[PDB]
Amino acid sequence: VNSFSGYLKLTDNVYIKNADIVEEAKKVKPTVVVNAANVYLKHGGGVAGALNKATNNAMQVESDDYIATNGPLKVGGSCVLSGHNLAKHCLHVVGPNVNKGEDIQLLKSAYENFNQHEVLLAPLLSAGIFGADPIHSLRVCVDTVRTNVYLAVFDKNLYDKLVSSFL
Ligand SMILES: CN(Cc1nnc2c(=O)[nH]ccn12)c1ccc2nccnc2n1
């Protein structure tokens, strides 16, 4: 038993809710919140900008030190950093950005990072300003992640389309 509430169950291990991931994180304090990161950990907009703003920019400060030491992430890769006031840990995961021409096949590699964590609160990777089809992203999530994932979808309209079209 865990503290996630109001989710619809899509499969054995994948759950979904119309929710703002920032508010959901502050209420649940999950062990892991996933950020929709870029390789530079520049949290300017989308989910990343929202999460970083909620940390009063502490996420960005920590991220800049990480990059200065380690260099950029790979598309499809991840790193574990602090969750600040939102979660114990933040798993920064880089899905391909279609608006940068990155290969959509890397979306599966991106979701494989979730399997290193037993339970996660996450957004749909490569959705939103990353330009992928969220229905495709949900399909890859379900077909790749084997650990317990709680997907927060900010847009109610999109949430309804995702549920109603789910096979
Ligand atoms: C309504 N939105 C934005 C949005 N608002 N909240 C969320 C969320 O929570 N996850 C992902 C997206 N998203 C759309 C709609 C069509 C899209 N078609 C292709 C890529 N992105 C798209 N985004």
The residue type found at 39 is V
* Strand 119-122 relative to strand 8-9, pairing: unpaired
Which domains occur in the chain, in start order?
Answer: 8-165 (3.40.220.10)
Looking from the CA of residue 129, the nearest atom of ligand 1 is 21
The residue type found at 120 is L
Cα of 68 from ligand 1 centre, angstroms: 31
Looking from the CA of residue 132, the nearest atom of ligand 1 is 20
Resolution (A): 1.0
Cα of 84 from ligand 1 centre, angstroms: 26
